[PDB]
């Protein structure tokens, strides 16, 4: 029997080291490995990879979902360092907490353009 | 403290129903929900989301990593249903299994263009 053990989303970025710095320095993730072409970050029990792309439109259309135990707590933590004006696309930003078919959630748009959703999970 | 429980890659497709069918009908995943705009499939406890995109170039550069206990067995299971001619882009296909920077793995390119890597985990 083959068992499925875990999954790793891949964000894309035209400038990978700049996007890794956001996830690590501002959002508190840990860098696992990485160079200008491909990098991995991690936090808690989850991992994210970041792969270089030549096309900005790919990054502006990439997303991922992460389940966390307390999205409101997480949102208040990051609201100290990330803009809450999501409409302003001149930097990264985060949405308010809202409802989704999956439950409470908010999203972060990172400086590369990826949209990562942080949703309730138990 | 906030805990990070799981992560869900998002594959993209111009035709979501067709890509969902590959994953469910050909690769044996289960369908959790889905319409023409967004869908969710699952195997074991790992999940993948599939989001519609209007631009093929996004699907052609989207990717995901899934960890499994035995990539060689999994490749053999899927060899009677997925082409092994990776270079023929008229349909989905998969690579040979071999060592890579990520560990022993193979990849599948699904009909929508996404590349999903199946790697040995622990
Ligand atoms: Cl969205
Ligand atoms: Cl690749
Ligand atoms: Cu959007
Ligand atoms: Cu490639």
TrEMBL record, chains A, B:
InterPro entries, per database record: Bleomycin-R (IPR000335), Glyas_Bleomycin-R_OHBP_Dase (IPR029068), VOC_core (IPR037523)
Coiled-coil segments: none
Keywords, comma-separated and alphabetical: Antibiotic resistance
Residue ranges, annotated region (Disordered): 85-104
VOC domain boundaries: 3-121
Lipid metabolism in keyword set: no
Alphabetized Gene3D superfamilies for the sequence: 2,3-Dihydroxybiphenyl 1,2-Dioxygenase, domain 1
GO biological process: response to antibiotic
Origin: domain of life: Bacteria
Family, per entry: Belongs to the bleomycin resistance protein family.
Protein name: Bleomycin resistance protein
């Amino acid at each position: 029997m083959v068992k499925f053990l875990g999954a790793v989303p891949v964000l894309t970025a035209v400038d990978v080291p700049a996007n890794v710095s956001f996830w690590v320095d501002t959002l508190g993730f840990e860098k696992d490995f990485g160079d200008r072409d491909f990098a991995g970050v991690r936090r808690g029990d989850i991992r994210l990879h970041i792969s270089r792309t030549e096309h900005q439109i790919v990054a502006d259309n990439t997303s991922a979902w992460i389940e966390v135990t307390d999205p409101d707590a997480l949102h208040e933590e990051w609201a100290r360092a990330v803009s809450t004006d999501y409409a302003d696309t001149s930097g990264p930003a985060m949405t308010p907490v809202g409802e989704s078919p999956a439950g409470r959630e908010f999203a972060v748009r990172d400086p590369a353009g990826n949209c990562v959703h942080f949703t309730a999970g138990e």
